Antibody
Framework: EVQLQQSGAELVRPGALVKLSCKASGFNIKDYYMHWVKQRPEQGLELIGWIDPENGNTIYDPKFQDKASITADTSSNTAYLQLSSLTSEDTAVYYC??????????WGQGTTLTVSSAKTTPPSVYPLAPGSANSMVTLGCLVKGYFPEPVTVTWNSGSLSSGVHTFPAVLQSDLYTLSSSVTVPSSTWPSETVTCNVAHPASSTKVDKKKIP | DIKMTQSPSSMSASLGESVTITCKASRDIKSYLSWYQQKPWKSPKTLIYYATSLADGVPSRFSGSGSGQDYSLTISSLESDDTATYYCLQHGESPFTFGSGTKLELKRADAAPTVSIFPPSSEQLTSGGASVVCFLNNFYPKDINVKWKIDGSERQNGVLNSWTDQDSKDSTYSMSSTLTLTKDEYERHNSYTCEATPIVKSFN
């Protein structure tokens, strides 16, 4: 299968210099044009430029002519994206994509770049049980005070999909706060064992919080 | 730099209805245009290429028309899982450019939320801070007011609201309202309540 693995979430300070990577597998990048795209929170797609690994040739959307510098290593099947003089304006999700020449048939999972002075901080995870209360039973998880984005939240380690709602994080202070809700039938909550799993890679934090009344 | 004007910015239709999205290029791109679909927190997925060709795995109800400088994406029989943002991209010449996109939403039938107020936790209280999260789940339309009442009155402290994107299955929206407080400020008053417009749920 054709895949494109991108480097992990990165938090760096203003004025720094980064170089994100996009590693191909299942095909040879020497054969395609690879592209880089930027996408800010709840906003559109913006191409930065592309490269032809064969000869090393590149072309950039003029907006990025002095911000970005795309490179490739045919040996390692890897494409890079360098961004200099970082500002908060550069904080966003970056994607690499293969261009067959008719469309973009493969996209990397994307890399989350945060430009800020804030320090990495693990979240606290507080279970949210009813405490009062009946056909349905809703309970939630509360991920408070982590930085930078993002965090992932699962229940029973993946088991139980529907009846799930994870709300987008908001800045409660210098940090992020996020909540998630699950909805299992009455008989379950009690007897069963409902837990939420949190992952905050940026601080190699993993946590499981068993719900309790 | 060939510019791409995409239209409309956002729109809604009821299931079954058909929507048409358009993109116009600043010059003739000779059908070297493609459409994409992007759902929330997800990467984009190719929909059409060469103006009219469907991509693999893509349904029939998605079709592309136009030529020259004018192009359009038509989705005939609208499905609740069609909620997303669509982008056109032109490769008539480098640098290639995307349209500003169209945010498409499903126009279903009114639906009241399912509220669930939650009391701060001990571990949280273990730290000088308390939060009272309220969940308003699966409702439509998306707009809604959220009011909190400490005991019987409304006093300033701190409220934060977060909405999920539209549901692929039932086409509803969900929101969380979290009342923030300092531990000791919480250990005073007694009847906390979150209202929605009314609808109420509370605890002592």
């Amino acid at each position: 299968e054709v895949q494109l693995q991108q480097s992990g979430a990165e938090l760096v300070r203003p004025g720094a210099l980064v170089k994100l990577s996009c590693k191909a597998s299942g095909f040879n990048i020497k054969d395609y044009y690879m592209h880089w795209v930027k996408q800010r929170p709840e906003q559109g797609l913006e191409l930065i430029g592309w490269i032809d690994p064969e000869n090393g040739n590149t072309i950039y959307d003029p907006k990025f002519q002095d911000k970005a510098s795309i490179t490739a290593d045919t040996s390692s099947n890897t494409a890079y994206l360098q961004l200099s003089s970082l500002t908060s304006e550069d904080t966003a999700v970056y994607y690499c994509a293969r261009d067959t020449a008719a469309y973009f048939d493969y996209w990397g999972q994307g890399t989350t770049l945060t430009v800020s002075s804030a320090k990495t901080t693990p979240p606290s995870v507080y279970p949210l049980a009813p405490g009062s209360a009946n056909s349905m039973v809703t309970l939630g998880c509360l991920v408070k005070g982590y930085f930078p984005e993002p965090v992932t939240v699962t229940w029973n380690s993946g088991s139980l999909s529907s009846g799930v709602h994870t709300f987008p994080a908001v800045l409660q202070s210098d940090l992020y706060t996020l909540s998630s809700s699950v909805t299992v039938p009455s008989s379950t909550w009690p007897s069963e064992t409902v837990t939420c799993n949190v992952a905050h890679p940026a601080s190699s934090t993993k946590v499981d919080k068993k719900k309790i009344p | 730099d060939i510019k791409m004007t995409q239209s409309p910015s956002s729109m809604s239709a009821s299931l079954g209805e058909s929507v048409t999205i358009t993109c116009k290029a600043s010059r003739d791109i000779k059908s070297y245009l493609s459409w994409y679909q992007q759902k929330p927190w997800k990467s984009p997925k190719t929909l059409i290429y060469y103006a009219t060709s469907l991509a693999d795995g893509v349904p029939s109800r998605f079709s592309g028309s136009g030529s020259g400088q004018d192009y359009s994406l038509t989705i005939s029989s609208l499905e609740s899982d069609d909620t997303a943002t669509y982008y056109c991209l032109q490769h008539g010449e480098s640098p290639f450019t995307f349209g500003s996109g169209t945010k498409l939403e499903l126009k279903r039938a009114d639906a009241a939320p399912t509220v669930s107020i939650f009391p701060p936790s001990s571990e949280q209280l273990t730290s000088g801070g308390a939060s009272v999260v309220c969940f308003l789940n699966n409702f439509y339309p998306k707009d809604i007011n959220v009011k909190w009442k400490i005991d019987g009155s409304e006093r300033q402290n701190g409220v934060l609201n977060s909405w999920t994107d539209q549901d692929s299955k039932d086409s509803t929206y969900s929101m969380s309202s979290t009342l923030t407080l300092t531990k000791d400020e919480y250990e005073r008053h007694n009847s906390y309540t979150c209202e929605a417009t009314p609808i109420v749920k509370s605890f002592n």
